[PDB]
C-alpha cells in the first residue's frame, strides 16, 4: 500500500534538519542531499508529479535560503535564486491542487514566508501591495495557530508592520512560546500602541543580543525596527539605538578576523544611527554645561569605534598562513582551511576626530583642547570635495607631474569646505594639531589647506600637523642612525660619508635580509628605495629593495626590531591607496605596517618625490632630531603655490604619521 514514487524520505530528512539538535556545520550537506533526491524525483516525472513533492521542494528551497548569510555589503545571488525557484515551485503547486486542508495551509505558509524573505531582500520585484494581498489571503485561509509554528509568528508580525489591524489575535500571539522578545515588542507597539511593555521587551531583547554573533537575522530585524521607529518620528529610538550599539561593540570584541571583515562590516548603519542618537541630544535646549562635554566625548568615542579594526588585529609559518588567508579574503576569494583614553594627550596638543555621516550625507569634526579641557564639534559637506579629490587622483594617475594645478584646486576646495581649521575659537593659533580622518580624508593632504582670502596662507605656516589612522595606535631606546640605500642612479655621494652611523648601515645594495636581522631598536632608520605603490591589492605595495623583498606582509612578519623607532623613507609610501577605500574603514600602506610593528614615528610621501627633496630632508633632520617637518616645509618654498605650482607640489608630499 506504498506508492512507488514517495517523498517521505525527504520530508523526514527536512524535519530532522529543522529542529536545533543538529550541528550548524553539518546542516548544509544533508539538506543538499534531500534537495538532490527531490530534484531527481522531479526529473523522473516531469509534469505528472504530485503537489506534496512540490511543497517539500519549496520547503527545502526556503530552508536552503535561510541557511545562507548576507556576507559583506552585497547579498550573494544563490539566496535570491533559491527564493525565486521556491516561489515558482509553490506557484506551480498552488495552480493545480488535489484538494486538502493541511496541504493548502502549508502551501500558503511556505509561499508567504518565501514572499516575505524576497521582499525583505529586495522590494522592487515584490512590492508591498502584492505582499499585502498575498499575506491577507494567507491569513484568510486560516493559518493562525500561533502555538505550533513560528512562521505564523512571522506572518502576524509582518501583517502588523504592513498596516492592517489584528486586535483579535494579540492574546494568543502573546501567549505563544515560539515568539522572541523583538516580535513581542513589535506586537506591543503595533497593536496595543503602548510604549512601556514594548520598551521592556525589546530592552530584554537587546540585553540578550550581547552573545548573538554578527550573522543572525536578529541584527537585521533590530536595524529595520529602529529605522522604522526613526521614520515615524518616535521619541523611543535614541536610547535603544545606543544600547544596540553597545551590544554591537561587545559582540565586536568577541569575533574573528575574517568574520570581522565579512559579517561585521554591515553594521555601519548601526554605528551611524547611534551617532545620530547622541547627536540629537546636546541641542538648543540647555542642560548643565558638563553634560554637553560628556555627550560630545561620547560622540567622539563612538566615531572612534568604527575606525581601522582589521589592522588592530595585526610559530612563524602560522602567521604567514593567516596573512595569506587574509589577503585572499580581501579579494572576495575562498579561504579554504590597556587602552589610552581620549583625554590622555600631551599638553599643547589638539586632536581632531573626523567622521563622515553617511546616513545624512554630512561630515562631523570633533575637537578636544587639552589646555582648556573643552569639547567642540562642527559640521560640513563633502560631495564637491570628493569630486575634486577624484579629479586630482585621475589626473595624477595619468600624468603624475602636470596635475599640480589640480592639487592647488583640491587644496583650495579643502580650505573652502572646512573654514573652521582657521578659526581662533576652534583650533587655537600656535598649536599642534592631530588628525584622525575617515573613509576618504586619509588621502587628502590636510596640511596643505589654503584659506579663502585675497592671498591665502597654508595650514603648515602656523600649525604643525600629525597623522594617525586611529586613536588605538597611540601608546603610553638606542642611538644608532642606521641607513639603508638602494639608489642606483647615484647623486647621494655627499651623504654616505657621514660618520653618525656604524656597523649597521648598508650603504649600497640594501636588501630585505639586511632589514630582517635588525635587533638594536635604532633611534633613526632611513630607507631610500623606490616606492612603486600598488593600487589594486594594496597588500603588496612593493617596497622595492635590492632583491624585491619586503613589500607589505614581510613587514608585518619578518621584521621585529624597530620598536620605538623613528623611520624616514624616501619613496611613494603612505598613499596611492585606492580612492574607493573598502567595505570598512581601513588604511593599507606600508607606513601603517611600520606603525603596526612598533615604530614610533614614520615620515612618508603622499606621491612621487624627487631625490633633491629627500636629500634635503634627510640632511636637515640629523642636525637636530627635535625639529618638526613644518619648519622645513615652510623654508623649502611650500608657500609658492601661486607662482610655481610644481615646487608646492613637490614640497607638500611629505607627511608625518607618528604621534609622540
Amino acid at each position: 500500500t506504498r506508492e512507488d514514487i514517495d517523498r517521505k524520505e525527504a520530508e523526514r530528512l527536512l524535519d530532522e534538519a529543522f529542529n536545533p539538535r543538529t550541528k550548524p556545520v553539518d546542516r548544509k550537506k544533508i539538506i543538499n542531499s534531500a534537495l538532490k533526491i527531490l530534484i531527481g524525483l522531479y526529473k523522473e516525472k516531469k509534469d505528472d508529479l504530485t503537489s506534496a513533492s512540490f511543497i517539500s521542494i519549496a520547503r527545502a528551497y526556503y530552508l536552503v535560503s535561510i541557511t545562507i548569510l548576507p556576507k559583506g555589503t552585497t547579498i550573494p545571488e544563490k539566496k535570491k535564486e533559491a527564493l525565486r525557484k521556491g516561489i515558482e515551485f509553490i506557484d506551480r503547486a498552488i495552480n493545480k491542487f488535489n484538494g486538502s486542508i493541511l496541504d493548502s495551509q502549508r502551501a500558503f505558509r511556505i509561499k508567504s514566508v518565501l514572499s516575505i524573505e524576497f521582499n525583505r531582500i529586495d522590494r522592487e520585484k515584490c512590492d508591498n501591495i502584492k505582499l499585502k494581498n498575498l499575506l491577507n489571503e494567507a491569513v484568510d485561509k486560516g493559518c493562525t495557530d500561533f502555538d505550533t509554528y513560528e512562521w505564523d509568528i512571522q506572518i502576524a508580525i509582518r501583517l502588523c508592520e504592513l498596516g492592517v489591524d489584528m486586535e483579535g489575535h494579540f492574546d494568543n500571539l502573546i501567549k505563544s512560546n515560539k515568539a522572541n522578545d523583538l516580535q513581542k515588542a513589535k506586537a506591543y507597539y503595533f497593536i496595543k500602541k503602548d510604549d512601556h511593555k514594548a520598551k521592556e521587551h525589546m530592552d530584554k531583547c537587546t540585553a540578550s543580543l550581547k552573545y548573538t554573533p554578527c550573522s543572525h537575522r536578529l541584527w537585521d530585524e533590530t536595524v529595520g525596527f529602529i529605522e522604522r521607529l526613526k521614520g515615524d518620528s518616535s521619541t523611543l529610538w535614541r536610547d535603544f539605538a545606543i544600547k544596540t550599539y553597545r551590544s554591537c561593540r561587545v559582540q565586536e570584541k568577541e569575533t574573528g578576523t575574517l568574520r570581522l571583515r565579512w559579517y561585521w562590516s554591515r553594521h555601519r548603519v548601526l554605528y551611524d544611527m547611534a551617532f545620530l542618537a547622541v547627536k540629537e541630544q546636546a541641542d538648543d535646549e540647555e542642560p548643565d554645561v558638563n553634560v554637553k562635554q560628556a555627550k560630545i566625548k561620547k560622540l567622539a568615542e563612538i566615531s572612534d569605534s568604527l575606525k581601522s579594526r582589521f589592522s588592530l588585529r595585526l610559530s612563524n609559518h602560522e602567521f604567514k598562513k593567516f596573512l595569506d588567508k587574509c589577503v585572499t579574503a580581501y579579494q572576495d576569494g575562498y579561504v579554504i582551511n590597556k587602552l589610552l583614553e581620549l583625554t590622555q594627550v600631551p599638553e599643547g596638543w589638539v586632536v581632531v576626530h573626523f567622521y563622515l555621516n553617511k546616513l545624512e550625507g554630512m561630515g562631523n569634526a570633533i575637537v578636544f583642547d587639552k589646555c582648556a579641557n573643552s569639547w567642540q564639534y562642527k559640521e560640513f559637506q563633502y560631495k564637491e570635495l570628493f569630486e575634486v579629490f577624484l579629479t586630482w587622483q585621475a589626473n595624477y594617475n595619468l600624468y603624475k607631474e602636470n596635475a599640480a594645478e589640480h592639487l592647488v584646486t583640491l587644496c583650495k576646495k579643502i580650505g573652502e569646505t572646512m573654514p573652521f581649521l582657521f578659526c581662533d575659537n576652534f583650533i587655537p593659533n600656535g598649536k599642534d594639531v592631530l588628525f584622525v580622518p575617515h573613509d576618504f580624508l586619509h588621502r587628502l593632504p590636510l596640511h596643505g589647506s589654503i584659506e579663502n582670502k585675497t592671498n591665502g596662507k597654508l595650514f603648515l605656516e602656523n600649525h604643525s600637523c600629525c597623522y594617525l589612522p586611529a586613536w588605538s595606535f597611540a601608546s603610553e631606546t638606542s642611538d644608532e642612525y642606521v641607513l639603508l640605500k638602494n639608489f642606483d642612479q647615484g647623486h647621494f655621494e655627499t651623504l654616505q660619508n657621514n660618520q653618525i652611523w656604524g656597523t649597521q648601515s648598508v650603504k649600497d645594495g640594501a636588501s630585505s635580509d639586511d632589514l630582517e636581522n635588525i635587533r638594536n631598536n635604532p633611534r633613526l632608520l632611513t630607507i631610500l628605495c623606490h616606492g612603486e605603490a600598488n593600487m589594486s591589492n594594496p597588500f603588496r605595495s612593493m617596497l622595492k629593495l635590492a632583491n624585491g623583498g619586503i613589500t607589505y606582509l614581510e613587514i608585518l612578519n619578518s621584521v621585529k626590531g624597530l620598536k620605538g623607532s623613528q623611520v624616514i623613507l624616501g619613496a611613494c609610501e603612505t598613499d596611492l591607496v585606492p580612492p574607493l577605500s573598502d567595505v570598512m574603514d581601513e588604511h593599507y600602506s606600508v607606513a601603517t605596517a611600520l606603525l603596526l610593528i612598533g615604530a614610533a614615528g614614520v615620515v612618508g610621501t603622499m606621491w612621487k618625490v624627487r631625490s633633491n627633496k629627500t636629500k634635503s630632508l634627510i640632511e636637515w633632520k640629523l642636525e637636530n632630531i627635535e625639529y618638526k617637518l613644518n619648519e622645513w616645509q615652510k623654508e623649502t618654498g611650500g608657500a609658492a603655490y601661486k607662482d610655481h605650482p610644481p615646487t608646492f607640489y613637490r614640497s607638500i608630499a611629505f607627511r608625518s604619521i607618528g604621534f609622540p
Partner: protein
C-alpha cells in the same frame, strides 16, 4: 542647411537588444545592460518578425566623443577657430536630468575662445552639442533643432515578409572567469547579428548651420567602435524535411527493434554523424564497409534488413529523396532524429536540471552619486595610433564552447525558471559562423589578452560590474586603449569528434554514467589578427605579451585562448607580425580621408611597403625578446615545457569503434587517427597521422600520482588541499599542469605499419570456439627489435614546490619501468612501455632529478597403465575430462586498485618457455603466406606469428592457458561457458559453477585474479620473444621444406561426452602429451592426396628445443595467490603445458621455466627492486599448499615446513596425471594416442583392432555409464578397455 545623408556599414557581428522606451527598461535587466546596442522591435503579434534600428542618441554620443577626441589633439583649435570646453553638467533642481548619465573622463582644454557662448554667437562645439537651441528634453517639432540625429534604418533585399529575427541574429552566452581559480562565476546572454547581409544602416542628420559643418564632417570619419562593432560612416550624394526524416527514423527504429537489436541504433546514429566528414561518394559508389568474405550475412550494422531491403539501400533512397537540403545537414538531422527516437523508446530524455547554480548576473544601482571628472593632457606629448596585423595558427586542436542549438534561438532563449532542458545528440559543441566557418570570438581573445596583461604587469584587479567610477589600475587603463577584431578562417569542413570516459579507481573499470564527446577543430588553421592601440607611448608590457604569443625558430608560441586548456586544447601561435604607426597630431587629415584601416586589414597585410598609403609608416622601434623587463621575468618563467619520447615495444592500440564502421576493411577496432590542416596546400592531408589522445596522457599521470600518494581513494574532495587537488585541479580550481598529445614520429620506417591480430574465446567443456565469440584487433605493429617512438610534452606552471616535482618525476619513472600500459588490452601485452628518453631541452632541475635458476624438483609417479605395458599395444583417448563436483569459494571483499596496500606485494617475473614437441601458432593476417594457392585453389597457407619479421608468441594465448590451469588448480567457476541447445546445456551445469556475474555474490579465485567484466585483473602478460634453438622442422617432400599439412579438424561434439539426460556434465577438457605428430609427418604424401584440398591447412612448423622468453607483471597480490601462480607456471618436472594448434595430435607441448622474480614495494620511501631468493619462493608455495589444504575442508597433513606433496588432494592428483609427460627423463615410453576413424574400410584403419565407433557407441557393449567413467578417468586404455 544641406540635409546630409549618412550610411552606416558594419564589419563585425553587432549586438541586438529588445526595445523598451524608458520605463519598461528598469524592469528588464537585459534592456538596461544593452543601452548601446541595436534595438529590435516587433511588427505584428506572435513574436515572429520585426524591424531593427539604431537610435539617434547613440550616434549623437559617438559623434560627441569623436569631436572631443579630435579637439583634444589640436588644443581646441580645429582649422583655426578656437573652441570652448562645453558643459556636460545638468542641475537636477533647475530642469530635468538627461536620460543617460556619463561616467567616463571628459577631455578638457584651455579656454582660448576669449568669449562666452550664447545664442547670438558660439563655437562649433557648442553648436554640435545643441547647448543653445530652442528644443530640449521634449520633442515637439523638428524645425527648432539646430543639430539633429534621425533614427537609422536597416536595408534589406528580400521584403516578401518581415526581417524574421531568426536569420538576422543568433543568441549566445558570454562569461566571466576569475583569475586565481580559472572557473566561471557568472554568465549573461546577448544576441549577435551578422554583418555580411544585414549590416547597412541609413539616416539623415539635417544640420541647420554651416559654421560647424567642417567639424561635423571630419568627426564622422573618426568614430570606430559603435554598437559593439567596427564601422565607418560616409556621406552620399523548411521543417517538413524534419518530419519526413522523423518518420523514416521511426520505421528504422521499428525494424531494428523487431530483430532485438535496439541498443545498436545509438552506434548507428553516431556512425551517421561521423559520415558527415566523408563526401556523398561514401553512399553513391557504395564505399561503406562490407561483411566478411563468403559469409551469409554481411555487416552486423549495415546489412540489417529494414522493411525487407538492406540498410545501405534505404540510406541511398533517403539521400536521393532529400538531396536538396545538402549532405551535412541531412547527416546531422538523421543522427539527431535517430538519437531522439532511441532515447524516447528507452524511456528518458536526460533533462539535466541544475540546482543552486547557473547564476546570470547583470551589472546593476546608478540613481545617485554622479560626478564629472575632467582630464587635461599637457601641451607636450603627442598621441599616436599603432596597428598590429598578423596571423594566428593553432598548434593544437582548439575548442571554443557554445551552448546547444536549442537555447541559442533568438526569441525564446528563456521562458521562466524551472525550465527543464533537452540534451541534444552532442554534449559539447563548437562555435561556427552561418557559413559553417570556424570563428575566434572577440570576447575570448580580449579575455586572453586581459589575463596575459595582468600576468605581465604582475598586479591587476578583478573586473567590477556596475562601478560608479572608472577603474584606475594599470590593466584597465591599458585595456581601454586596445581594439580587437573578430577572426574567421577560410575553412568550412565539419569538425571532428573526440570521446572521453572516466574510470572507477576501485575496480579499474569504466564509471557508470561517464561517456561524452567533444567537437574539436583541426590544427594548423590560420586566423587573422588585428590589434589597435591609441595612446601616448607604446607599452612595454603589451609588446612583451606580443612577443610572448609569437612563434619563431627556437621558440614556440604560447597563446592559451579557448577552453579545455588542461588537455592542451587551444594553444595558438601568432606569425607574420607587422607593426605600422599612425601620427595623429600632424597627419589627422589623412587618417580622416581613409577611415583608419578598418575593413581592409587583409589588404594592408598583403601589400608591400612601396605601395603603403600616405601617413602610415613602418614602426622600426619594436623591441626584441631579451630586451623587455616584463618578459623573461614575469611572463616567460610561467609555463615550463617537458617533452620526451616514449618507446613502445608492443602492439599499441587506441580503439575508436566509430571510424571502424565507416572505413573499408571490416575490422572491429582501428587505431586512433588525427587530421591536421596544411597551410601550403589548402587540403587536410594525403594521409592522416596516428597519435594518442592527451586525455589518456593526463589520466595516466593523474592515476599514477593518485596511487603513489593514496589520495585517489578519498570519498570526498570538499575543502581538500591534497596533492591531486593541487597539481591536477578539481571542480573548483584549474589544473596546474597541461598535457598535449603523443604523436608518432617514426612511421616512415615501417612497412605494413599496422598488424592484424585475431582472438577467440574457448569453451571450458567442449574445448572449442564459443558461439559468436570471435573478434579481431588491428593495432600498430610494435616489436622489441623495432619500437614505436611517441613524442609528447606537458607544461608546468610556476609555483611548484619540491614535493610536487618529486611526485611528477616519480610518476614519470614509474611510467618508464612499465607499470601503466598505454591503450587497451594491457593485460595481454598491448601497448607496453619499454623506456623513455628525455632530450636536452627540459629544465635542469627536472633533468638532474629524473636520473641462479629456480627449480621445483617435484616428480610425479604418473599412471601405471602405460608404465607396466611399456612395449606397445595400447591406445588412449586424445582428451579426458576433470570433475570437481560442486564447491566454489566466493570471496566477498575485493582487493581494490585504488592504492598499493602495505600488506600485499607487487612485482615482475621473468620466465622462459621451452618446447617439448614442435609448436604451431598461425599468423592468420593473410590466408596465403607461402603462396600455394596458385596451383591448389582454396588451400590455406599460414606462417608463424611474427611482427616486423621476427617470431613472437602472443600474450593472449599464454594468459588463456595459465588461466585454464589456474581455474582447474583452484577449483573455480567456468569463466567461459556456452548455454545453448544440445534441457539446455546450461541446465546440466550446477548453479554454483556458473560464471561469476556481478560483485554482489563475490568473486571466485579464478575471476578475482585474472579479472572479470566489472573488475580488472591484477596479472598482466607480455608477448613472448624467441632467442635460440633449431628452427623450421625440415621434412623432405613438401614444396616448402619447413611446412606441414595437417588433417581434418572437426568441431567438438558434446553428444559423445554426455549421453541421454540421466547423465551429468563431466567438466573441463584436457589434452594428453604424446609424440603423435610423427604419424602426421610420415603420411604427408597420403594426406595430400586422399584429402580434398579444402578441409586441411598447411602451416610453418617449429621444432623441439626452442626457447621463448616472456614476462609476467602483477600488482596488489596476496601471498598464497602468488604461490599458486608460481606453482601454475611450473608444477615441477615431468609435468608440462599444452599450447597451440594440433593439441589432439600432440603438437603444442611447452615447458615453462621460471628465471627470476622481482618484488618491489611502494609504501616504502620511494621504491626498490629486490631479488626474492629461493627460500621466500619455497615459503610461498608452502603457503599456497596450506591454502589449498584449508580449502579441501580437512587437515589431512599437519602444520609444518616440508616439501609439499601435491598428489594428496584428489583433484590436484587427477590434474597432474592429466599433464604428466611420459617421455622426458630418458624413458622409452612411447604411448599411442589417436581417434577411431569412423567405421571399417576407412582411411587410417588399424585393420584388426575393432577400434571403431560402430562397436563403441552401439549401447549393446560398453554402456553409457561405463563410457563416461572411462572418459573421466585419465590415461585409461580404450581398445583394451580397462
Amino acid at each position: 542647411d544641406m540635409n546630409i545623408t549618412v550610411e552606416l556599414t558594419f564589419f563585425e557581428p553587432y549586438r541586438l537588444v529588445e526595445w523598451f522606451d524608458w520605463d519598461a527598461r528598469k524592469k528588464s535587466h537585459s534592456a538596461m545592460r544593452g543601452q548601446a546596442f541595436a534595438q529590435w522591435t516587433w511588427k505584428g503579434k506572435g513574436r515572429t518578425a520585426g524591424k531593427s534600428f539604431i537610435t539617434g542618441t547613440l550616434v549623437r554620443s559617438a559623434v560627441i566623443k569623436a569631436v572631443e577626441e579630435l579637439l583634444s589633439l589640436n588644443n581646441g583649435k580645429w582649422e583655426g577657430v578656437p573652441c570652448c570646453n562645453g558643459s556636460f553638467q545638468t542641475d537636477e533642481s533647475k530642469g530635468k536630468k538627461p536620460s543617460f548619465l556619463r561616467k567616463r573622463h571628459t577631455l578638457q582644454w584651455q579656454a582660448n575662445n576669449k568669449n562666452i557662448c550664447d545664442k547670438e554667437e558660439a563655437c562649433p562645439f557648442c553648436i554640435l552639442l545643441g547647448r543653445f537651441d530652442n528644443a530640449g528634453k521634449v520633442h515637439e517639432r523638428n524645425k527648432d533643432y539646430d543639430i539633429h540625429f534621425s533614427n537609422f534604418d536597416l536595408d534589406h533585399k528580400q521584403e516578401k515578409n518581415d526581417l524574421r529575427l531568426v536569420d538576422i541574429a543568433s543568441g549566445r552566452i558570454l562569461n566571466r572567469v576569475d583569475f586565481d581559480t580559472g572557473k566561471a562565476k557568472d554568465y549573461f546572454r546577448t544576441w549577435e547579428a551578422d554583418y555580411e547581409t544585414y549590416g547597412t544602416y541609413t539616416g539623415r542628420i539635417t544640420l541647420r548651420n554651416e559654421h560647424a559643418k567642417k567639424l561635423l564632417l571630419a568627426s564622422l570619419g573618426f568614430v570606430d567602435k559603435l554598437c559593439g562593432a567596427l564601422c565607418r560612416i560616409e556621406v552620399i550624394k523548411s521543417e517538413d524535411h524534419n518530419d519526413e526524416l522523423r518518420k523514416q527514423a521511426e520505421v528504422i527504429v521499428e525494424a531494428f527493434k523487431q530483430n532485438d537489436k535496439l541498443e545498436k541504433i545509438r552506434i548507428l546514429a553516431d556512425a551517421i554523424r561521423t559520415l558527415r566528414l566523408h563526401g556523398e561518394g561514401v553512399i553513391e559508389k557504395d564505399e561503406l564497409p562490407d561483411g566478411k568474405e563468403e559469409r551469409d550475412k554481411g555487416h552486423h550494422l549495415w546489412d540489417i534488413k529494414v522493411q525487407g531491403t538492406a540498410l545501405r539501400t534505404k540510406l541511398k533512397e533517403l539521400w536521393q529523396s532529400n538531396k536538396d537540403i545538402g549532405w551535412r545537414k541531412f547527416t546531422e538531422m538523421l543522427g539527431s532524429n535517430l538519437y531522439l527516437i532511441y532515447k524516447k523508446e528507452t524511456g528518458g530524455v536526460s533533462t539535466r536540471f541544475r540546482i543552486l547554480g547557473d547564476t546570470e548576473y547583470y551589472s546593476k544601482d546608478s540613481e545617485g552619486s554622479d560626478l564629472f571628472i575632467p582630464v587635461t593632457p599637457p601641451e607636450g606629448i603627442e598621441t599616436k595610433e599603432w596597428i598590429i596585423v598578423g596571423r594566428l595558427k593553432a598548434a593544437t586542436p582548439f575548442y571554443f564552447g557554445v551552448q546547444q542549438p536549442s537555447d541559442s534561438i533568438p526569441g525564446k532563449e528563456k521562458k521562466s525558471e524551472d525550465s527543464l532542458v533537452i540534451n541534444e545528440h552532442t554534449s559539447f559543441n563548437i562555435l561556427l559562423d552561418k557559413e559553417n566557418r570556424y570563428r575566434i570570438p572577440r570576447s575570448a581573445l580580449r579575455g586572453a589578452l586581459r589575463r596575459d596583461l595582468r600576468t605581465a604587469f604582475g598586479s591587476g584587479c578583478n573586473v567590477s560590474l556596475g562601478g560608479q567610477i572608472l577603474c584606475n589600475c594599470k590593466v584597465c587603463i591599458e585595456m581601454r586603449r586596445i581594439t580587437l577584431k573578430d577572426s574567421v578562417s577560410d575553412f568550412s569542413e565539419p569538425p571532428e569528434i573526440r570521446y572521453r570516459i572516466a574510470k572507477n579507481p576501485g575496480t579499474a573499470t569504466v564509471e557508470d554514467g561517464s561517456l561524452f564527446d567533444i567537437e574539436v577543430g583541426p590544427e594548423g588553421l590560420t586566423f587573422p589578427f588585428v590589434l589597435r592601440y591609441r595612446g601616448h607611448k607604446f607599452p612595454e608590457q603589451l609588446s612583451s605579451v606580443i612577443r610572448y604569443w609569437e612563434e619563431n625558430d627556437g621558440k614556440n608560441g604560447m597563446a592559451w585562448l579557448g577552453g579545455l586548456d588542461s588537455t592542451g586544447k587551444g594553444r595558438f601561435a601568432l606569425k607574420d607580425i607587422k607593426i605600422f604607426e599612425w601620427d595623429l597630431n600632424q597627419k589627422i587629415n589623412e587618417y580622416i580621408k581613409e577611415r583608419g584601416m578598418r575593413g581592409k586589414e587583409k589588404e594592408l597585410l598583403e601589400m608591400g611597403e612601396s605601395s603603403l598609403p600616405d601617413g602610415l609608416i613602418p614602426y622600426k622601434f619594436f623591441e626584441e625578446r631579451e630586451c623587455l623587463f616584463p618578459y623573461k621575468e614575469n611572463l616567460k618563467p610561467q609555463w615550463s615545457e617537458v617533452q620526451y619520447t616514449i618507446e613502445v615495444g608492443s602492439p599499441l592500440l587506441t580503439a575508436d569503434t566509430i571510424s571502424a564502421l565507416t572505413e573499408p576493411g571490416n575490422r572491429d577496432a582501428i587505431a586512433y587517427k588525427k587530421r591536421v590542416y596544411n597551410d601550403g596546400n589548402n587540403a587536410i592531408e594525403p594521409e592522416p597521422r596516428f597519435a594518442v589522445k592527451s586525455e589518456t596522457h593526463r589520466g595516466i599521470f593523474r592515476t599514477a600520482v593518485g596511487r603513489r600518494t593514496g589520495d585517489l581513494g578519498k570519498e570526498d574532495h570538499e575543502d581538500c588541499t591534497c596533492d591531486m587537488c593541487i597539481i591536477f585541479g578539481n571542480e573548483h580550481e584549474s589544473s596546474k599542469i597541461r598535457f598535449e598529445d603523443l604523436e608518432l614520429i617514426n612511421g616512415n620506417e615501417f612497412e605494413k605499419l599496422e598488424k592484424h591480430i585475431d582472438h577467440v574465446a574457448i569453451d571450458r567443456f567442449t574445448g572449442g570456439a564459443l558461439d559468436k565469440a570471435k573478434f579481431d584487433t588491428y593495432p600498430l605493429a610494435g616489436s622489441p627489435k623495432k619500437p614505436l617512438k611517441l613524442k609528447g610534452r606537458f607544461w608546468i606552471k610556476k609555483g611548484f614546490s619540491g614535493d610536487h616535482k618529486l611526485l611528477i618525476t616519480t610518476a614519470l619513472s614509474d611510467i618508464r619501468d612499465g607499470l601503466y600500459p598505454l591503450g587497451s588490452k594491457g593485460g595481454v601485452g598491448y601497448g607496453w612501455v619499454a623506456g623513455i628518453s628525455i632530450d636536452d631541452n627540459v629544465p635542469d632541475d627536472f633533468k638532474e632529478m629524473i636520473n641462479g635458476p629456480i627449480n621445483n624438483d617435484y616428480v610425479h609417479p604418473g599412471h601405471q597403465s602405460p608404465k607396466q605395458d611399456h612395449k606397445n599395444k595400447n591406445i588412449y583417448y586424445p582428451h579426458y575430462f576433470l570433475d570437481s563436483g560442486s564447491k566454489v569459494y566466493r570471496e566477498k571483499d575485493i582487493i581494490t586498485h585504488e592504492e598499493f596496500t602495505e600488506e600485499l606485494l607487487s612485482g615482475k617475473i621473468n620466465c622462459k618457455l621451452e618446447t617439448l614437441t614442435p609448436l604451431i601458432i598461425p599468423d592468420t593476417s593473410d590466408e596465403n603466406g607461402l603462396k600455394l594457392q596458385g596451383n591448389k585453389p582454396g588451400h590455406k597457407n599460414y606462417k608463424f606469428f611474427n611482427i616486423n619479421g621476427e617470431l613472437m608468441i602472443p600474450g593472449s594465448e599464454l594468459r588463456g592457458m595459465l588461466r585454464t590451469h589456474f581455474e582447474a588448480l583452484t577449483k573455480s567457476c567456468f569463466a567461459i561457458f556456452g548455454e545453448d541447445s544440445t534441457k539446455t546445456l546450461g541446465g546440466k551445469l550446477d548453479k554454483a559453477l556458473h560464471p561469476c556475474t556481478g560483485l554482489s555474490d563475490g568473486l571466485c579465485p579464478g575471476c578475482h585474479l585474472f579479472g572479470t567484466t566489472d573488475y580488472k585483473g591484477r596479472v598482466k602478460f607480455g608477448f613472448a620473444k624467441y632467442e635460440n634453438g633449431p628452427e623450421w622442422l625440415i621434412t623432405r617432400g613438401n614444396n616448402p621444406e619447413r611446412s606441414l599439412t595437417l588433417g581434418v579438424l572437426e568441431s567438438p561434439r558434446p553428444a559423445f561426452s554426455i549421453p541421454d539426460d540421466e547423465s551429468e556434465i563431466p567438466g573441463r577438457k584436457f589434452y594428453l602429451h604424446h609424440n603423435g605428430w610423427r604419424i602426421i609427418r610420415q603420411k604427408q604424401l597420403e594426406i595430400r592426396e586422399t584429402v580434398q584440398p579444402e578441409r586441411n591447412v598447411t602451416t610453418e612448423v617449429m621444432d623441439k628445443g626452442n626457447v621463448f622468453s616472456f614476462d609476467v607483471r602483477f600488482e596488489n597480490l596476496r601471498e598464497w595467490e602468488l604461490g599458486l601462480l608460481l606453482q601454475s607456471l611450473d608444477p615441477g618436472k615431468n609435468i608440462a603445458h599444452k599450447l597451440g594448434k594440433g593439441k589432439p595430435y600432440g603438437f603444442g607441448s611447452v615447458k615453462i621455466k621460471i628465471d627470476s622474480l622481482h618484488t618491489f614495494k611502494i609504501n616504502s620511501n620511494n621504491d626498490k627492486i629486490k631479488r626474492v631468493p629461493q627460500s621466500d619462493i619455497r615459503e610461498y608455495i608452502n603457503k599456497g599448499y596450506q591454502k589449498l589444504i584449508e580449502w579441501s575442508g580437512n587437515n589431512s597433513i599437519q602444520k609444518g615446513n616440508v616439501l609439499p606433496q601435491w598428489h594428496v588432494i584428489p583433484h590436484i592428483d587427477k590434474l597432474y596425471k592429466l599433464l604428466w609427460v611420459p617421455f622426458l627423463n630418458d624413458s622409452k615410453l612411447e604411448p599411442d594416442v589417436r581417434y577411431p576413424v569412423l567405421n571399417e574400410e576407412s582411411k587410417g584403419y588399424i585393420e584388426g583392432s575393432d577400434y571403431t565407433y560402430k562397436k563403441l557407441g552401439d549401447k549393446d557393449n560398453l554402456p553409457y555409464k561405463t563410457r563416461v567413467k572411462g572418459l573421466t578417468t585419465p590415461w585409461s586404455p580404450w581398445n583394451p578397455f580397462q
